[PDB]
Scaffold this active site. Structure first.
Site, short mmCIF file in Angstrom:
data_model
loop_
_atom_site.label_atom_id
_atom_site.label_comp_id
_atom_site.label_asym_id
_atom_site.label_seq_id
_atom_site.Cartn_x
_atom_site.Cartn_y
_atom_site.Cartn_z
N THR A 1 0.85 -1.23 0.00
CA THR A 1 0.00 0.00 0.00
C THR A 1 0.86 1.26 0.00
O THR A 1 1.87 1.33 0.70
CB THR A 1 -0.96 0.04 1.21
OG1 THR A 1 -1.95 -0.99 1.07
CG2 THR A 1 -1.66 1.39 1.34
N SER A 2 0.45 2.23 -0.80
CA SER A 2 1.06 3.55 -0.82
C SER A 2 -0.04 4.58 -0.67
O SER A 2 -0.92 4.67 -1.53
CB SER A 2 1.82 3.77 -2.12
OG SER A 2 2.85 2.81 -2.28
#
Ligand code: MG
Ligand code: MG
Ligand code: MG
Ligand code: MG
Ligand code: MG
Lengths: 212, 226, 222, 196, 195, 125, 233, 204, 196, 195
Positions: D1-2
């Site tokens: 996840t970013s």
């Protein structure tokens, strides 16, 4: 497994069951737990099947080499000790073996050696090895005499395996009988436990608990 | 297990294989994995089979009572919210992995639900041991504005990919089509590509082959009069 | 940690007839829930009218078969092209297997052929080399599904003659090669239905005095 | 996840990738990690999807009940509710949440709540597995009081690099713009951001 | 195996050793002689892990018999006990150590004295008036501490040994199937066939 | 706070009458007429929709209620008491039957469960 | 015994009427870090064989050197090194298979899954698999890692059995491979957009294609997806 | 250690033409030790029959539990419970112990008294219903039973033919399992008569 | 540790921080992680200090003996010797080495050898615990054929950010310039690079 | 504790139970009666974990004695055995289960039949002609299978029991210090004081 061997007036009786299991799964009902080392010597198979098979036919080779070199039948003491010394070299490696080395010579008479993968080597008159050993011991101890006839001794060994085969879940299939004399062992047939049980129940009046 | 869900023009379709297994052994060769939460909200389950059946009935029950209470037809988001909050409470110990699909007054919907209580939205989804085989087909052929006939074709082709390539999946394809303004149509055994061939031999025994010790009549009737 | 062993599934079946022997095996090869190959031959002609299969971990299986085939070749070199009898092959395989007693070939080996009297012979080995001549032996994934069926349909176990009611057993009449092949096919069809690792294809090798013959049959691919 | 949230002149913008993985399998490649707890209070979610969804749903409930009684809540209030749940249940949660919102009085505000349950008010915040690779870039390129177009470019370039290096991140770049004007959703596809 | 006792009296050493051999669940034998004659006036009893016990005992026996032939001379009990200790001390740091505890009862023909040595599997040697291995000492030493005298006769030693065995038979959970008793004196080694 | 009324509010009078039950039956007597007729191939239940005001939408007030797919209910007396009984009757058909046997309860047993709820309000604190 | 450090993901392959196709992306991952973007994982041996390798890259590079050394060694005292006594795919595979099984048997494996694709002297298609365990198998379609789960199902729809191979053209086969690579890019978190593809044909020989990209991707539908259940905005 | 295989035993059920059959071995053991050759695993509540394999204490407990529940069912419903209904009751009851389950493999068999339709069903220890048309298997030799049933079974067998099929399925499966055997019982169930037959088998 | 090597027009420059830690204690704050294996072949060391020193010393020996026999070795040759040691002894080593060198024929070359023992020839390479934070920055800012002054600025800015975020990195920024002109050492202190 | 045997003959039930109580290293007692009278014609022997055995047995005893007073009636052996099974079946899923195995020997005065029930700590009940717990069955069942008849007298039952005990004393490693034997018949419960 249930294997037994006992000394008596007429020599040695060797009796074994025939069942091999992998967990609860019955792999075979026709296993040979008596190794014919040579025409005069017998070994029983308990613990590791391969370990018993491999090393006891090897033992037969060593016994053959002995009598070629020494021009004389190997003693049961010497034959058993070849096996016990061998497995003792492998101690720790994970060999699994519980066997009776059985023979009848001039100098010794009928002789039985219990040999073990821990290196144990015991001479004795009655031995019983396997998951069903306790059941066979009971029948043996209460009925054994030195002055048993060859006929009665054979039946006792057969009946003692049946006792184990019935109770012990990991014993059964069929009973193999051998009689060891000075002139060599004599095979006394394969006896299906299923048929033997009903036969013995009726003729002997035993196993009243079981409905037949 | 292979289960898929596919959105289309005027609704949504779900599909599933029909093999339930115990380890490497096939327990049931024609299992019904498509469960009904409400008349027009259906779901397919993978993971612990008891948990999937149990959690759909419980929510399906509470959904029915909610529908009666509110005098409104049940919504997929309600089934979704109830399922996830239940599953989350039990922290994944209820091993239910569901694809929930249906139609309601809001429209047509398609969600997935994992055992820890996470949910996802999508136009096409797959779950179970054959999900990767099925998703490969879905990623290869899915497009926007699929028709009803195209979505059924895609869904069943995705299940087939699981049936053939995944050992955990097999036998038949079940399909249920939920279209807006229509009754949901459950198509049990929509495809049957795994009928067993005729055996080489009949194993019907001669009568009296089995050895018998005792016969007796069993009294199933109650205590009699007179 | 590195695990040197794996399970490639598969199921094999050896049956000894009166003057013939069959060794059959499915052609599916797997890991976990994936199919590697729908046709990967598992039963091999090793020469001298001996057929062999080492079922279980395919790498050890392939290694053993290779080493045995090699042993047959060197038996000819060392002993004036003498034919390796099935009993001699069996004892040789014991030593190959027991050679790796403390890092075993993770396979259940079966060989089939004819003995020196021309009768059908099947030998069955555990992973570490304990072996026995047998009439009937299934090995591998669906062995537990097949053997009880064979006990009943080959050896006629628990079957008695109608009218006698348990007093007279059904007689053990000899089965033809056509009759055995039916039982092999039905064994594998049933195993395919109820075991996920069994399917795709069935390859049977039939051994007679005339030589080794092959038969192939389709199995369900799900 | 970013994920990230960046304040600017007119308010605040939340940004996120769309990849959700189960090991190395991408379970969902079009995930919406930008979630709405109030009209102009949104959050970015990282960590356990089950946990962060459950938390967000509870917060949305709390802010809905707050609004019914006391009117529109502050972004600080929303962050406090997030914190209360994350801190008090730290033993049973794996949640890293960035809270971003727009007041008229306070304008754009960003609060980050890492694993422990602590709260940190920041001009901008980055989080998720892919954030590690863009600490250098974001620190060098962030300016306060950027324009909407500059902030979109800053987030787009930042998450592009995060996606490029982090296998756990990928798919589309979603963004949500929070200003006085309202709520604007933006989406940017691989063909656009990969060539940056 | 289980219980092995030793007592040095005025003019002899007495070794008592259990007869039982147990393979986990069953008692396979009730007449096992846990001893080897190393030389005409030196007897060694032993107890420990199966196989290792007899293998070790026979190995020692062979070595002492070899020495006896080479030099045409019987080693003193002290010399034999030192040899045995070294073998066990060597063994304890080996790849797989001998798990064997021994008692060496000997009559020194030069000094005209009985001698009892206690050596455990580590190579821990001690010369004692009376000794044991395992749990045997726990039950018996309080009796031996009380009754023992250095000027005891062989018959008195046997009586004190009977009392020790009785206490063992009363308070030990295991059935060790009685003991074989042997006496080592100036005339050599003999077995007490009724005990 | 706490419900400190842990004692019965319905009790036997010297004459053996349970006053509150009798008075409840009096309230039923005042209620609008409802009826039921059983045929060979069906049952009918009917009542009058007594509209409290013409501005009220009487369709939103359901006097006849589905309890299960094969069971329906109608009443006479206090409407609000009926409404909550319908809610409880619907739930109890699931909790004490459908969630156990995987099917809807037979009419007599559902009636039995409803009766039990009404009996308890006649004895409980 | 080790653990893989720098890793390469799926290698996919299939047979067609006149030869074989094999493909693999150009990524060298370092756990979840997409560290190296220019790694060639298809290594040609001569003009008739291409070895595709997944798993540990350091072990790949070692294997690459063994194959380079194998070509050198085969040329020694061999006048027919570029003719009748040139390296066959079957020779190259069997050699690798031997090495892999030997190494697993010393409890020190080459942490790889390998697919040897090529065409034999007689024009026969060669396609066989070997991995760190020394396990080998052949099939009309072969794939490693994620490819096994996602590529094979798609490739098997083209060539489902042996009899489908003569019916499959190089255009259809390449299309199926390229599509499979796109699917793996969608769904494998350790994959890259850039890949290499090699065709070994019995008529046109070895065609090695570098710097290929996954194209014609569907993402537009992502814009409509909002929240995770109840969210509308 | 594994509770489902301490005591051992098996149950198998089959459908035929206007009939069902359910059968079980008689063995109870403590792992390798055989303890009882009279431990029947099939019970009945009215005309609905329930076989139960697995941990013997639970087998007993659940039988006592379903007797309890079907007795109350009958008093309130004024009719005997049906196989379809009972199946759901068994499922409900097992799942209520979801995180502390009875270690059993139940098998329901019977004929619906109103429709006359033959019915069988199986469960895992946790309540998942397996409603097969053909046959249900359970116990320590379930693999063996699957193999036997799959090959021996054909649909629409007459009662006296079905008896032979299920008996031979049980017997030969039990003879390949160390923890099964020591006698066997077969119930042949028709709409208004039930025959119970004890089979002669090897006692090892 | 934060280390990197960057090729440019005139050759190659190696860069490194100077922090060596034992847990959270800085055992040495002025470490020289840029080590010389040949006149114009240097390396950056990361991982076990004992291992990387032992490796470097052995390589230096091998290149000294190579030079005595066959003249100046190539940068590729040096990288191969590093690889051979790292690969063959992978079970007992924790070493991440960047090899950088200057030939006249090949000019500036950079080879990175990560844990596994693989070799990767690159235009530039980054490694060490602090490198994770500057993947984004370095990828965005690197250009080929930069000048000496540009490359120094690129390394200085990159390691500045790596030091800023990584607690395991710090102290001074050391650099070594490899060109035809010779070998130039550079040092940059905290007061200089922190304000960047 | 260790060995408990049971045998149902024609007109009585005989329970044999070891006398030893071992605390690890030492045998603390050699006269322990591992049985409780639940009612005049119902006797229960027991073996298992220390403390739990007696605590359970006395708890059952109290409950049956309570029932006997309340109803002025003795429960049938079958009824008592069912009650006992339930208590153990309840126990096995408790926080800390009773680790107790029991034999219930009773004479049913209504049916005029002896009855022997074997119940383990899991609540596994079986009615048997003869029974045991632990390893006791392994040694004894082969003898009981052979000699047992349902029409045996009490004296014949005791003789077969002696043979079972002898076999145990021969092949068991543990010294269980003999057995206390009790007979349950129509006249009640009595102890055989010489065995
Ligand atoms: Mg299958
Ligand atoms: Mg959680
Ligand atoms: Mg990515
Ligand atoms: Mg059995
Ligand atoms: Mg048995």
């Amino acid at each position: 497994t249930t294997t037994l061997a006992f000394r008596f007036q007429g020599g040695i009786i060797v009796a074994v069951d025939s069942r091999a299991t992998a967990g609860n799964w019955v792999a075979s009902q026709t296993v040979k737990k008596v190794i014919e080392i040579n025409p005069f010597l017998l070994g029983t198979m308990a613990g590791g099947s391969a370990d018993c098979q491999f090393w006891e036919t090897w033992l037969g080779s060593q016994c053959r080499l002995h009598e070629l070199r020494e021009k004389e039948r190997i003693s049961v003491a010497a034959a058993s000790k070849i096996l016990s010394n061998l497995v003792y070299q492998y101690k720790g490696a994970g060999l699994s073996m519980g066997t009776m080395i059985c023979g009848y010579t001039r100098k010794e008479g009928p002789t039985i050696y219990y040999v073990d993968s821990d290196g144990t080597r015991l001479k004795g008159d009655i031995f019983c090895v396997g998951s069903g050993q306790t059941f066979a011991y009971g029948v043996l101890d209460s009925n054994y005499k030195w002055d048993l006839s060859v006929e009665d001794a054979l039946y006792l060994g057969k009946r003692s395996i049946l006792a184990a085969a019935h109770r012990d879940a990991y014993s059964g299939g069929s009973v193999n009988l051998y009689h060891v004399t000075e002139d060599g062992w004599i095979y006394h047939g394969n006896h299906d436990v299923g048929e033997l049980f009903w036969k013995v129940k009726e003729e002997e009046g035993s196993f009243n608990n079981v409905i037949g | 297990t292979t289960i898929v869900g596919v959105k289309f023009n005027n609704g949504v379709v779900i599909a599933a294989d029909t093999r339930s297994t115990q380890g490497p052994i096939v327990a049931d060769k024609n299992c019904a994995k498509l469960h009904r939460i409400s008349p027009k909200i259906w779901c397919a389950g993978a993971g612990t089979a008891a948990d999937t059946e149990a959690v759909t009935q419980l929510i399906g029950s509470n959904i029915e009572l909610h529908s009666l209470y509110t005098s409104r037809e049940p919504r997929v988001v309600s089934a979704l919210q109830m399922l996830k909050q239940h599953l989350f409470k039990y922290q994944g110990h209820i091993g239910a992995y569901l694809i929930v699909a249906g139609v309601d007054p809001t429209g047509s919907h398609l969600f997935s639900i994992h055992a820890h209580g996470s949910t996802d939205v999508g136009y096409y989804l797959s779950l179970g041991s054959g999900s990767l085989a099925a998703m490969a087909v879905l990623e290869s052929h899915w497009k926007q504005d699929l028709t009803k006939e195209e979505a059924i074709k895609l869904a069943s082709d995705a299940i087939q990919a699981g049936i053939w390539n995944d050992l955990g999946s097999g036998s038949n394809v079940d399909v249920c089509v939920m279209e807006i303004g229509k009754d949901a149509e459950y198509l049990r055994n929509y495809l049957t590509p795994n009928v067993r061939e005729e055996k080489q031999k009949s194993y019907k025994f001669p009568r009296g082959t089995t050895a018998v010790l005792k016969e007796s009549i069993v009294n199933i009737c109650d205590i009699q009069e007179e | 940690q590195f695990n040197p062993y794996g399970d490639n599934g598969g199921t094999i079946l050896g049956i000894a007839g009166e003057d013939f022997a069959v060794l059959a095996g499915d052609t599916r090869n797997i890991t976990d829930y994936s199919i590697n190959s729908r046709y990967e031959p598992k039963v091999f002609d090793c020469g001298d009218n001996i057929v062999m299969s080492a079922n279980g971990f395919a790498a050890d299986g392939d290694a053993l078969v290779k080493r045995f085939k090699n042993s047959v070749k060197w038996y000819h070199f060392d002993h004036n092209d003498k034919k390796l009898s099935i009993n001699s092959a069996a004892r040789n395989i014991q030593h190959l297997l027991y050679g790796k007693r403390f890092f075993p070939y993770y396979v259940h080996t079966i060989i089939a052929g004819l003995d020196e009297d021309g009768k059908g012979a099947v030998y069955s080995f555990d992973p570490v080399g304990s072996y026995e001549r047998e009439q009937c032996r299934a090995g591998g994934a669906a062995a537990s599904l097949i053997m009880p069926f064979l006990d009943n349909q080959v050896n006629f176990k628990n079957q008695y003659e109608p009218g006698t009611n348990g007093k007279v057993k059904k007689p053990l009449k000899y089965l033809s090669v056509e009759e055995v092949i039916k039982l092999v096919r039905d064994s594998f069809t049933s195993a395919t239905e109820r075991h996920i690792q069994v399917g795709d294809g069935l390859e049977i090798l039939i051994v007679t005095k005339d030589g080794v013959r092959k038969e192939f049959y389709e199995l369900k691919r799900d | 996840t970013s994920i990230m949230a960046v304040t600017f002149k007119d308010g605040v913008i939340l940004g996120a990738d769309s990849r959700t993985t189960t090991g190395a399998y991408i379970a969902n490649r079009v995930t919406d990690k930008l979630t709405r707890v109030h009209d102009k209070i949104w959050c970015c979610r990282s960590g356990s999807a089950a946990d962060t969804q459950a938390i967000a749903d509870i917060v949305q409930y709390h802010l809905e009940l707050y609004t019914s009684q006391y009117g529109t809540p502050s972004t600080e209030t929303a962050a406090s509710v997030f914190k209360e749940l994350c801190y008090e249940n730290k033993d049973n949660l794996t949640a890293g949440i960035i809270v971003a919102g727009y007041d008229d009085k306070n304008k754009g505000e960003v609060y980050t709540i890492p694993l422990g349950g602590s709260v940190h008010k920041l001009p901008y915040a980055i989080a998720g597995s892919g954030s590690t690779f863009i600490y250098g870039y974001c620190d060098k390129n962030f300016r306060e009081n950027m324009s909407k177009e500059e902030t979109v470019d800053f987030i787009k370039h930042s998450l592009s690099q995060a996606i490029k290096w982090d296998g756990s991140s990928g798919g589309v770049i979603r963004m949500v713009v929070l200003t006085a004007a309202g709520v604007e959703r933006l989406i940017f596809y691989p063909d656009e951001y990969e060539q940056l | 195996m289980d219980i092995i006792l030793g007592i040095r009296v005025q003019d002899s050493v007495i070794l008592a050793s259990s007869k039982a051999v147990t393979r986990g669940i069953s008692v396979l034998k009730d007449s096992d002689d846990k001893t080897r004659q190393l030389s005409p006036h030196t007897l060694m009893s032993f107890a420990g892990e199966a196989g290792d016990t007899v293998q070790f005992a026979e190995y020692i026996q062979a070595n002492i018999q070899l020495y006896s032939i080479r030099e045409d001379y019987e080693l003193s009990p002290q010399a034999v006990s030192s040899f045995v200790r070294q073998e066990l001390a060597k063994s304890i740091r080996s790849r797989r150590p001998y798990q064997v505890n021994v008692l060496i009862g000997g009559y020194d023909k030069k000094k005209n004295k009985p001698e009892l040595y206690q050596i455990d599997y580590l190579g821990t040697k001690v010369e004692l008036p009376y000794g044991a291995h395992g749990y045997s000492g726990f039950y018996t030493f309080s009796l031996l501490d009380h009754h023992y005298r250095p000027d005891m006769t062989t018959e008195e030693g046997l009586d004190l040994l009977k009392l020790c065995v009785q206490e063992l038979e009363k308070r030990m959970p295991m059935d060790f199937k009685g003991v074989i008793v042997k006496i080592v004196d100036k005339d050599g080694i003999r077995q007490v066939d009724d005990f | 706070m706490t419900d400190r009324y842990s004692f019965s509010l319905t009790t036997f009078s010297p004459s053996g009458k349970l006053g509150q039950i009798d008075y409840a039956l009096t309230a039923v007597k005042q209620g609008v007429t409802s009826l039921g007729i059983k045929a060979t191939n069906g049952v009918v239940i009917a009542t009058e929709k007594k509209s409290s005001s013409p501005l009220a939408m009487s369709e939103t007030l359901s006097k006849v209620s589905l309890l299960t797919p094969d069971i329906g209910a109608v009443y006479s007396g206090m409407g609000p008491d009926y409404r909550v009984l319908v809610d409880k009757s619907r739930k109890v058909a699931h909790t004490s039957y459908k969630r156990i046997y995987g099917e809807y309860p037979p009419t007599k047993l559902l009636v039995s469960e409803v009766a039990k709820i009404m009996q308890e309000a006649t004895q409980s604190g | 015994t080790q653990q893989p450090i720098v890793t390469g993901t799926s290698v996919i392959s299939m047979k067609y009427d006149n030869g074989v196709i094999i493909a693999a992306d150009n990524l060298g991952s370092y756990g979840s870090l997409l560290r190296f973007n220019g790694v060639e994982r298809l290594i040609p041996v001569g003009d008739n064989t291409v070895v595709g390798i997944s798993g540990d890259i350091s072990d790949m590079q070692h294997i690459e050197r063994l194959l380079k050394d194998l070509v050198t060694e085969n040329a020694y005292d061999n006048p027919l090194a570029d003719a009748e006594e040139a390296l066959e795919p079957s020779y190259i595979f069997e050699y690798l298979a031997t090495v892999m099984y030997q190494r697993r048997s010393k409890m020190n494996p080459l942490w790889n899954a390998i697919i040897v694709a090529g065409v034999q002297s007689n024009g026969d298609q060669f396609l066989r698999y070997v991995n760190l365990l020394g396990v080998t198998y052949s099939s009309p379609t072969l794939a490693t890692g994620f490819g096994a789960h996602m590529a094979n199902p798609l490739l098997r729809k083209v060539v489902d059995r042996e009899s489908d191979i003569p019916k499959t053209t190089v255009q259809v086969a390449e299309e199926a491979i390229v599509n499979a690579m796109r699917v793996l890019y969608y769904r494998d978190a350790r994959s890259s957009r850039n890949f290499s593809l090699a065709i070994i044909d019995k008529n046109t020989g070895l065609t090695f294609k570098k710097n290929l990209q996954v194209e014609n991707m569907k993402w537009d539908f992502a814009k409509d997806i909002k929240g995770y259940g109840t969210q509308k905005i | 250690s594994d509770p489902s295989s301490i005591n051992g035993g098996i149950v198998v059920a089959m459908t035929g033409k206007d009939c069902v059959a359910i059968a079980c071995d008689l063995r109870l053991g403590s792992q390798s030790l055989g303890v009882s050759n009279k431990f029947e695993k099939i019970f009945h509540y009215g005309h609905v029959f329930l076989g139960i394999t697995g941990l013997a204490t639970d087998v007993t407990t659940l039988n006592e539990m379903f007797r309890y529940k079907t007795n109350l069912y009958k008093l309130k419903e004024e009719r005997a419970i049906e196989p379809e209904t009972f199946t759901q009751l068994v499922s409900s009851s097992l799942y209520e112990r979801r995180f502390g389950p009875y270690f059993v493999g139940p098998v329901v068999a019977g004929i619906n008294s109103k429709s006359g339709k033959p019915f069988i069903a199986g469960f895992d220890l946790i309540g998942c219903i397996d409603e097969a048309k053909d046959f249900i298997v359970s116990g320590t030799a379930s693999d063996q039973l699957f193999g036997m049933c799959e090959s021996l079974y054909e649909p629409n067998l007459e009662p006296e033919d079905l008896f032979e099929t299920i008996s031979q399925a049980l017997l030969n499966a039990a003879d390949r399992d160390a923890l099964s055997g020591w006698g066997a019982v077969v119930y042949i169930i028709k709409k208004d008569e039930v025959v119970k037959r004890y089979l002669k088998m090897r006692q090892d």
